[PDB]
């Protein structure tokens, strides 16, 4: 995506699925961009900041989107370990 | 499936050479029976003597009469029906005059609505049919 002068030449950098790390196409309308709201440790309130997970349509069709999002939320402290 | 082995070259080559004989053009070009049955004997043109004039009926969807000539080739003494191409060009042709005759363009296949005619008259009496058609030359006296 960089020419030999080091300049970036792409139109845009496409998203990769947060589960399978595969590019999400411009016409893959089944892909989701979920935002999960972060919460303070003592008061349990929305902080205005969130963590985003992009899931392609291939996993959503297969039905592994639920487990994928669960693993992504467990790997970032939002879901309690075990 | 096909065999993919480092020492299968003999098998692959033998299979390819055996299967080539199931190809129409390869068989007609290498078996040799097509060349013997060729009236020209493998040539591009042939000189014959016009045995007679004849009119053939075109294939059914379109109706006309094609003015062909039955000739006898000098080289092998075969009998051929050659289509005199244009209009009034049969008038340029008489009986028992040598004509140079070429193929019809489809390599032994009959051309168009004309049934079983794969040859066309190119020259008549040692002067081209085109020259007679365009009036450039006349029939020799």
């Amino acid at each position: 995506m960089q020419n030999d002068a080091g300049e970036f030449v792409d139109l845009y950098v496409p998203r990769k699925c947060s589960a399978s790390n595969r590019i999400i196409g411009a016409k893959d309308h089944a892909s989701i961009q979920m935002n999960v709201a972060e919460v303070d440790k003592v008061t349990g309130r929305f902080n205005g900041q969130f963590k985003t997970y992009a899931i392609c349509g291939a996993i959503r069709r297969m039905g592994e989107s639920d487990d994928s999002i669960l693993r992504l939320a467990k790997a970032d402290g939002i879901v309690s370990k075990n | 499936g096909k065999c993919r082995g480092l020492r299968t070259a003999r098998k692959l080559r033998s299979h390819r050479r055996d299967q080539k004989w199931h190809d129409k053009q390869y068989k007609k070009a290498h078996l040799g029976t097509a060349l013997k049955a060729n009236p020209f004997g493998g040539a591009s043109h042939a000189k014959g003597i016009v045995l007679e004039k004849v009119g053939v009926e075109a294939k059914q969807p379109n109706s006309a009469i094609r003015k062909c000539v039955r000739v006898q080739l000098i080289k092998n003494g075969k009998k051929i029906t050659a289509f005199v191409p244009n209009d009034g060009c049969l008038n340029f042709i008489e009986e028992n005059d040598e004509v140079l005759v070429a193929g019809f363009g489809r390599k032994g296949h009959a051309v168009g609505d004309i049934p079983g005619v794969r040859f066309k008259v190119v020259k008549v009496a040692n002067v081209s049919l085109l020259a007679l058609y365009k009036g450039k030359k006349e029939r020799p006296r």
Binding site: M1, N3, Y12, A26, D28, H29, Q33, A54 | -
Partner: protein
């Protein structure tokens, strides 16, 4: 003018989507061609690849309609193909132009050898398929031109591909399937994971979120 009927259309009309690549980034569907008209403007050149009369046999005779296959796209990296069938040729062509505007996809351009200057060819070999028509695009050296059949050549030229190598297999005599397979191969460019795209993505706010206040305040 044009009153948008979608949230994406309203955001696009209200001068707050910087580029068409934001929608492509978030895979949002375009349902109004005026978005493409606004974003690409006069750079889009359309042509009718084919008009095909298709007939449905009826009791009284044959109901004949015309299917227009129309390619479109600025010669700079965006291409689209649209098929519309209607009772009249003019209406079919208009509908095909609208549909091709709706189906614009970004084309990723790459390099054959050294990466000097602008990218000229496809990033890698890519294959598109549409019902037995297989079209393969291979990177080509600079200045080669588009070695392709007329329909893929026109599609690739509208895609902005400077030069390419093409292979075709199947019944490419059906222009519709040939065009759709070439379009599939072209659109598969940005969906191919090359090593330079291995860098982990930094997710940005979707337009339905980063201007949700503008939408609600109406």
């Amino acid at each position: 003018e044009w009153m948008p009927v979608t949230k994406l259309g309203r955001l696009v009309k209200d001068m707050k989507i910087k580029s068409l690549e934001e929608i492509y980034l978030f895979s949002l569907p375009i349902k109004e061609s005026e978005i493409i008209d606004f974003f690409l403007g006069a750079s889009l050149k359309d042509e009718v690849l084919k008009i095909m009369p298709v007939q449905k046999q009826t009791r009284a005779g044959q109901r004949t309609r015309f299917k227009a296959f129309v390619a479109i796209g600025d010669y700079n990296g965006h291409v689209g193909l649209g098929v519309k069938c209607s009772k009249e040729v003019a209406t079919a062509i208009r509908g095909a132009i609208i549909l091709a505007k709706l189906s614009i996809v970004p084309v990723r351009r790459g390099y054959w050898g050294n990466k000097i200057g602008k990218p000229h060819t496809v990033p890698c070999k890519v294959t598109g398929r549409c019902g037995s028509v297989l079209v393969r695009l291979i990177p080509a050296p600079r200045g080669t031109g588009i070695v392709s059949a007329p329909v893929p050549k026109k599609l690739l030229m509208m895609a902005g591909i400077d030069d390419c190598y093409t292979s075709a297999r199947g019944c490419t005599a059906t222009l519709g399937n040939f065009a759709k397979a070439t379009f599939d191969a072209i659109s598969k460019t940005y969906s191919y994971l090359t090593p330079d795209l291995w860098k982990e993505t930094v997710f940005t706010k979707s337009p339905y979120q980063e201007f949700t206040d503008h939408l609600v305040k109406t």
